[PDB]
């Protein structure tokens, strides 16, 4: 629609920030892009890549997901809703992926990064997927700084949508891993107010939210509307003021504007 671009434009200005958007309609492989080629701080939406990178590995390491991992009281960071229940205990990689994807647990992310060899190797996995834009550079919690102009821990809407389609729908992962990722994302607890709040209440959403400094509010989602082919929707939104508040409603409006007619 001619209007869509102009609507996202006004949405962006009224919202007073920088709005990145990339929608893939698997019905006709069409796309809606808005600043789809600019870098945005990923924030916790980065957690999908790390877990996917662990999933990839398990394909070539029968278990891997069952390996236990020590939760040291030293490990705790700023947001630890599941790990904190296992200090001086362990959690499987399967349990950390789940905890990272569905509760945005920051310790589990750090564990995931650990077991794939640091952020550079998670980036190396993105390259094995043909994603040339994704870069993980830091650990939790500092990778969420979202300091403007910084390129650390960023990607583009276009890159992340194609990648997320490859992971949840395509063949980046074996059939069993693909299904596990989708179950995990389908079970997220943090997304109710972001992409999902812009869709009909009946559609099924698997999403990973992200938030960070400068009012940065992100969400990346695979969507299965009833009686339709799925959509991949990346919405990234960032703000000038370092202490600007989150704006999850911006992401819902964006999802609102790009699905009108679907
Ligand atoms: C990841 O992007 C996730 N949050 C964090 O990583 C947090 N801090 O790291 C800098 C954090 C602070 S409070 C909190 N709940 N998380 C994003 N935060 C949102 C949110 O609504 O706060 C959800 C967690 S409910 C996941 S996204």
Author numbering: 27 to 288
Give sentences from the paper:
The complex crystal structure of CTX-M-15 displayed that the DFC molecule was also covalently bound to Ser70. The carbonyl oxygen atom of the amide group in DFC was within a hydrogen bond distance from the backbone and sidechain of Ser70, and its nitrogen atom was also within a hydrogen bond distance from the backbone and sidechain of Ser237. The aminothiazole ring of DFC was involved in a p–p stacking interaction with the sidechain of Tyr105, but the amine group on the same ring did not show any significant interaction. The thiol group attached to the cephem ring showed a hypervalent interaction with the sidechain of Thr216.
Cefotaximase-Munich (CTX-M) extended-spectrum beta-lactamases (ESBLs) are commonly associated with Gram-negative, hospital-acquired infections worldwide. CTX-M-15, which belongs to hydrolases (EC 3.5.2.6), cleaves lactam carbon–nitrogen amide bonds rapidly, deactivating β-lactam antibiotics. To understand the mechanism of CTX-M-15 activity, we have determined the crystal structures of CTX-M-15 in complex with two specific classes of beta-lactam compounds, desfuroylceftiofur (DFC) and ampicillin, and an inhibitor, clavulanic acid. The binding pocket of CTX-M-15 for those β-lactams was established by the residues from both the α- and α/β-domains, surrounded by the catalytic residues Ser70, Lys73, Ser130, and Glu166.
